[PDB]
Symmetry: C5
Subunit: 395 residues, 5 copies
């Protein structure tokens, strides 16, 4: 028997090992597969249709009972590499998968004596995760990965873990911290999945916690919003000169409204979408629009000869609002006296025109008070969100 050790061991082991039979000697005992998953990177988190792209490394060992050999005979060999198509491989397939594939297959597997069979493989998974667009700048996502056997039951395949849960929870020795997402926790759990009154199935759920790094996003979205909160600072105190005022706003109401389009284009729009900023930015504009509507109505009322409607209706309006906020010489002298009346009529109009500019100069201050309350509330909401974002990582 002048043959190499590896060739003689491969000939002896795979001579009659038929694939298809669950490898076990008594059908009573189930076979156990133990798994391990380590994260490498996060490629894409698309919020339009709840798609998460992940890359992981993997490892699965299962005891075997038709590949036992004594190392004393075959020249002290203790580990062999065999093709993956010549033995039995369990159908451990992850759930919540969309277009699974895009990952090569490893054509070799290890085997030890007694049946310790190991396998290493990469998985590039496109999964379905319920992403919450709420708290957009500082979101904390909680995604799930479900490993189970698609066919076998609890009394056929049981899934345990290689290493303990703790050492699995904190594992960032391979992950690259260059993307826009950062790992927090990979928590494993095991339970049983039964739907009808007949079959019992194993199940292992990995909960993956991710945070978003928002420093760069903030400086490109918030800073322009805080800088554009000087428009109220600019247009202030000009009811008589509301021609210039209206000028100002008629162009400002479009200057940021034109890029509101590109802002909404840059938002990862979600059908179930209600961001805190995306509703404050809307009511901010609504309030500004109604303020300008009130100012235009006031200047239209006071610009004409209406004289703020001196009928007692405006008294009632003011009262309700206050409750709410709780022979030749004959011709000579004739011509002399004729023009004095016209001059007096010309001169009398100035005070009458200028006496009706107080209502706008009063109500603009209340509108500005409402605006300051709104921006203070917005800042408080932003501060407490950032506080929640910072305190989310203490656990």
């Amino acid at each position: 028997t002048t043959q190499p050790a590896l060739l003689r061991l491969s000939d002896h082991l795979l001579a009659n090992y038929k694939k298809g039979v669950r490898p076990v000697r008594d059908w009573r005992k189930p076979t156990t597969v133990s798994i391990d998953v380590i994260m490498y990177a996060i490629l894409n988190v698309d919020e339009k249709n709840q798609v998460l792209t992940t890359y992981i490394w993997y490892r699965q060992y299962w005891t075997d009972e038709f590949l036992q050999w004594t190392p004393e005979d075959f020249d002290n060999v203790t580990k062999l590499s065999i093709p993956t198509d010549s033995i039995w491989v369990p159908d451990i397939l992850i759930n919540e998968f969309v277009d699974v594939g895009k990952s090569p297959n490893i054509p070799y597997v290890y085997v030890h004596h007694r049946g310790e069979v190991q396998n290493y493989k990469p998985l590039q998974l496109v999964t379905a995760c319920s992403l919450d667009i709420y708290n957009f700048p500082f979101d904390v996502q909680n995604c799930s990965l479900t490993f189970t056997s698609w066919l076998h039951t609890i009394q056929d395949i049981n899934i345990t873990l290689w290493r303990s849960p703790e050492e699995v929870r904190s594992d960032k020795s391979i992950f690259i911290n260059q993307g826009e997402w950062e790992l927090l926790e990979v928590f494993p759990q095991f339970k049983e999945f039964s739907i009808d009154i007949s079959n019992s199935y194993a199940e292992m759920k990995f909960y993956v916690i991710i945070r978003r790094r928002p420093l760069f996003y903030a400086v490109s979205l918030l800073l322009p919003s805080i800088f554009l909160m000087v428009v109220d600072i600019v247009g202030f105190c000009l009811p008589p000169d509301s021609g210039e005022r209206v000028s100002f706003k008629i162009t400002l109401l479009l200057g940021y409204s034109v890029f509101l389009i590109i802002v909404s284009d840059t938002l990862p729009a979600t059908a179930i979408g209600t961001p805190l900023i995306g509703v404050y930015f809307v009511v901010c504009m609504a309030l500004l629009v109604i303020s300008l509507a009130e100012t235009i109505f006031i200047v239209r009322l006071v610009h004409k000869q209406d004289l703020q409607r001196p009928v007692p209706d405006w008294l009632r309006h003011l009262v309700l609002d206050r409750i709410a906020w709780i022979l030749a010489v004959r011709g000579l002298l004739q011509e002399l006296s004729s023009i004095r009346h016209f001059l007096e009529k010309r001169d009398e109009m100035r005070e009458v025109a200028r006496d009706w500019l107080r209502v706008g100069y009063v109500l603009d201050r209340l509108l500005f008070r409402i605006y300051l309350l709104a921006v203070l509330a917005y800042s408080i909401t932003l501060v407490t969100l950032w506080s929640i974002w910072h305190y989310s990582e203490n656990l």
Copy 2:
């Protein structure tokens, strides 16, 4: 015969089972496959080209007659797992499929004694469904899934059901209610599909009813439309000051017209597309445009020296419209008397200019009445649609 039970059973059963033969002993009796489908999630409903993406779980059992064995001999075994490439698998393929695939294959199947053969598999299907864009905010879609054998006839393969129709109709124990679509009914039906005068085929149609969750869509599309229905409230009562009016509209007619582009971009445009809102929003603008055209024509007519055309033609126009809506001192006194005529001519023009501002102040009220009728009709249509949406789920 010192061999394991599973290996000896696999050797005995698959020794001479040739694949290809329909498994039956008398060609007269047909084989029956029974199916079951459970929904998991809805990934995409693209209305541009009638594409529906669905994920389901599946289950198919077929009686077999060359895999019968007695459990008394082979150590009380009652269920075995065998490779899927060593036996006969029916070609149950769903119709209305586009780019079917993207789903793994399960390499194992169960077998019981007597021939009970089972199979579990996931299907990710991209189907063609006739989606109705009408009733966009609150649509109720009715899609169809057709299972049949692509080759075999009614006397070769018959498709029945595992569980009864009722228990199949109400099955939401696995479905995730996080997307923008919500399951209502999965109704199964069975019939025969024959086109020529020769072949008879089995057919099972699953009708799937889906609704759209429109709360988030409403607050992002309707609320701005209701808020922008204050433009008529702002521009009111100013025929003499139609310079400011025209100012107002010339900018409002673009302020929402510029984002009408992004609105139309966000609509899932369909060739066969006529949404109730998408036609009301158009006639709303048309009516506003023609109202502004009438006001501009009126102010152009009354601004010049035409004096609303005092010829009797305007009497006829008003009548038809009413039917429609059913030595030195000599020079001294001379110079004194010369300027009085010029002053009188200057002063007489004011009343003549101000006496022709009534026609616009009358017709704007009728235009506003038409506008109020339009918005009331729009609100009534929205209310009855929401009522239909709410009452669609009582069945």
Copy 3:
């Protein structure tokens, strides 16, 4: 021989049938394949790069001569199902294909006695068709599908038809009439394709006629164009008040020019692209632009002190254009007489200013006549196109 009939027939037939040999007994006679195609739906017609997506059903029968058996022996069997990888399958591949695939393979085929071999399969084809963008609203496309053997010649494989051409021409019993395209005719033809002076090849061409359903497209593109043809109705008769006129157009020349962008975005742009509407809509704007240029030049000429250039050059211009369209008291009286000259000079300017507003009021009518001729021609062209569209289906 206590064996089932099907297993014994499969063992007898496929025992020595080697695949690869054209199934025939004398190499002289060629084998004939007969095909049949039925349309299901049209998924996409992309005009950017001449891509047509179609789904069809299929059917091909070929006589066989190594699978003959007598039904008297094998228990009165007359039809058998055999795997598709164990027999000879012709390489009938369609031409004009791009990324062909995306369609499953049927693993079974029928066989009768004497050699009648049948096969059913679906084909999802992405073909290259020369689409004419001309007559965009109402196009009638004529696409081609070419079936031939990629390798074999006329004396090896001949392609005939299952059913007659007539019954093939009118076949809409399966087609779904929910899309934007509607079937008209599926005409089959057979001929020979030879390019060099040596090989002769069979060829079957199916001509497919499709029409577009333009009702929904019309109401979304034409109706706004007809509604926006009121701009000339609005801006009419105002040469002295050309400040307001210029106001009007300077904003109208952008109001539809801003969404012209989105219009051109919505057009399926084709390199070889010259739609009748897409050239009329351009010359429509050109004519309007040159009309406004003429009006602005006229008002600039008449606004200043040029007084329409009273030099005899304008006489020549008008003639050529007409051819084209075929001690104290001393100071007292002094001061009295000094101001009368200034008053007369002030009063004399009004008639001189108002006497030069006729040329624009004359040429605007000619410009409007040209505009009415243009819109009448546009309406006539639209009417005759729709007439061609309606009369295209009488055949």
Copy 4:
């Protein structure tokens, strides 16, 4: 031996023909493969990342020496069809390939007596070609296709040609002239590719010449540019009325600037991108912008009380520029004499205001001369490019 001729020939030939051995009897002589390529269509020419999509037909013959038979024995057979997986196929793979595939495989090949082995197959190739965006409207592209054996050397596989180069150069009998590209020349060449000092490899390069059909592109891009070159014709001769002028340009500087966005969107943007039109259209606007800046500065200088700076600095500026272009009655008469001075002061301002409007009326003519020189140069460049485009096809 009562067997069919084809079955007996297939049994005799493929009985012991092992695949893998280069088919030759003396390892010294190399085997020669002869190829032929015929073009069908051009699907896509993407200039963003240098991707060319092509479809071709193909043909390759190689002498064989283990499939020789005498036609006298096997019933006068001279041509046989054999599966492509049972014989030796050379690894002739094209270089410069990206995502090669998307094309079916032909499962049969011809064989003659003596070893003449033929093969026909379609190839759909996505190649990398250096496309020059320069001369965009009328480009002449020169792409390369490189056929070589990926493994074998010059003394193992040599690649010659089926037909001569001339008959290969002019081959448009199958090509469809409906796209935006038109074939000019398919020139074959053969040489040797060696990089190190050890291996020698065969290489066949097909140079493919393509032109663009620009008639439709011209009418959609140039005609609007020539039509919009009337803006200088419109705004001419109005320094005093520069309010209307500034009005005009402030809106024209945006009227085409707003669709400049969509123009740049429609350009196939290339990183290495410098089109002749794309630089002329930019300098055209730059020149117009600086002209308007000069006019606005001039009108701002002459509008105020600066009076074109009558200090001798403007003399130096003009000189340098010219070098560059090479008791009661007492009160009565008092009041009479008081107002005459005010009237004279009022009347004297008109000539002083009107005497400073010449500098703009002089410099605008020079600016227009520069503009005319620019447009004449642009037209000359366009004419000579079209001349180059027309003369490129004379070869």
Copy 5:
């Protein structure tokens, strides 16, 4: 033994060579694979999600010990081509891979006497690289390619290099210099990758250095920015005529703001994105916006009757700012004397109105000084970046 040499050698060698066994005779010695990589082109560098597309050529040799033969016997043969599926191929797979594939497989490999086994193959790789958007116009990217065995350890497979590192570092004999990226260095390194306390793995890292060719990008982005830095040159010295000024800016603040959208669209936006230009262009606009806000506030203060607030508060404001920058005849004469007071009142207002236009004419110069400092800093930053870009290639 009248057989060809190649057929007899193939029969002798592959007669009993079982695949799967690592080819070695004593399990103690490991097998060594030596690799070589040569770059061809760079197809895509997408900065949105860190994707790098590369094309390389490859070469791997491994000693074999079951394919030794003596050339004396088998007719002086020294090199043979054998199928790649009949021997042992190591699983050398690159790390950092996304959707690896898209590249054909070579079905043949070389073998020499003694076991020298060679293989050539192309790889089209989509890898994940951390691209730095900082220094956008002139970036120097440093990407990594990691070759290792996915399964085998250091004592099973060791990876060395064919040629030395130097000759590998400088290799541009095949690379095409037509794209937007240019090769600088391909540096190889070898080390060991161990994560736990048990397994030791080989690892070869190729560092690839790429630069961007920014000439064409510069002329399309910078030149417009330098040309648009004349807006401050145009609007200068006009506090009284701030109506025209405000006119100017209200349109300039939108003229480039409208294409800022398309600028941001053309930027390859990265979540971690902070380009030097992209922050200078923002603060440039911020500074201009606040300058215009100050000017509008100043002109609003000085336009009304406030008279720059002559209360001593403005003295304190100026001081703090300076610290910061460190019977008939009776009626006759009566009427004569009445109008003189009105004339004096009319004439006195001019000097009072004109005496308050100095503060804006002073502060605009300081604002322009800040603007000049900003643009000088921007130019200095651009110059030093280009200097870094030029000096990066000296190594």
